[PDB]
Amino acid sequence: LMGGFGMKHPPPQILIKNTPVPADPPTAFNKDKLNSFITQYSTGQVSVEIEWELQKENSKRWNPEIQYTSNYYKSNNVEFAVNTEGVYSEPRPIGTRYLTRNL
Amino acid sequence: LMGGFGMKHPPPQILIKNTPVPADPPTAFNKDKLNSFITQYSTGQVSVEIEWELQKENSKRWNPEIQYTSNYYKSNNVEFAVNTEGVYSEPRPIGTRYLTRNL
């Protein structure tokens, strides 16, 4: 209902964790689980590659259609670009529905 | 200079004429060329087929571009459509330059 593709078997969940590294244990045995760990974090890169299938427009419509565009008029910033402070922003929601079909 | 594709050998001129059909000549010989003809005209269909080669956009531009669009706002007529009297019109000149390239 929020939109998109419903699937019985969607892309699976990808779970990641830093494995705990204990700090120095005591030299006499203790049965309690170790609550003392080395402070730790990880970084890396992720690649996601999705192949998308397209359905072309076959239309016989004579007149030109509505298309999504940028507006030429001068502005302080470029839409869908970085800020003067380095902040990327998305100025507007963009749907998919521009081209037309008969009903 | 008015625009388009200059060619040493452009598409050739296609010339068409109704062949003159004389009216009834006199029954005694006269050497003058015949100035009396049957009133006549022709009609038919013409097909022109042109194959056009395309050069695709390779751009790495991040932000969306300017595109030619129809405007959604309500109007008495549809642009590039027929009139209520049957008159087709072209409301605006449309150039080719919307997509961008680096210089």
- Is-contact A80 B62, C-beta < 8 A? yes
Opening angle at CA A49, ends A78 and A70, nearest 5? 20
How many angstroms separate the CA atoms of A67 and A59, rounded?
A: 14
- Is-contact B78 A66, C-beta < 8 A? no
CA distance B11 to chain A (A): 27
Which residues have CB under 8 Å from B89's CB, separation 6+?
B80, B83
How many angstroms separate the CA atoms of A37 and A18, rounded?
A: 12
Of B66, B68, B72, the CB nearest to A70: B66
What is the distance, to the nearest Å, from the Cα of residue A12 to the centroid of all Cα atoms in its chain?
15
Opening angle at CA A13, ends A8 and A15, nearest 5? 165
Question: Helix or strand or coil: residue A77?
Answer: coil
Please state how this structure was obtained. Answer: cryo-EM
Q: Which two tokens stand for residue B98?
A: 């919307």
Place of tokens 């459509």: B81
Which of B59, B60, B67 should be substituted to probe chain A, the one whose Cβ sees the most A Cβ atoms within 10 Å? Answer: B67
Interchain pair A65, B69: CB under 8 A:
yes
Q: Which two tokens stand for residue B102?
A: 């680096």
CA distances from residue A79 to A38, A71, A94, B5, B73 in whole angstroms, order as listed: 45, 9, 12, 36, 23
Name the residue in chain A with its Cα closest to that of B68: A67
Of A62, A70, A79, the CB nearest to B81: A62
Assign 3-state DSSP to chain B and report helix, strand, coil percentages, each to 5: 0, 5, 95
Of A99, A101, A102, A103, nearest to A65 (Cα)?
Answer: A99
Q: How many CB pairs under 8 A join A and B?
A: 43
Taking the CB of residue A98, how many other CB atoms lie within 10 A of it? 14
Of B56, B67, B70, nearest to B98 (Cα)?
Answer: B67
How many angstroms separate the CA atoms of A99 and A96, rounded?
A: 9
The torsion angles phi and psi of B4, rounded to 5 degrees, stand at 100, -160
Quoted resolution (Å): 2.4
Assign 3-state DSSP to chain A and report helix, strand, coil percentages, each to 5: 0, 5, 95
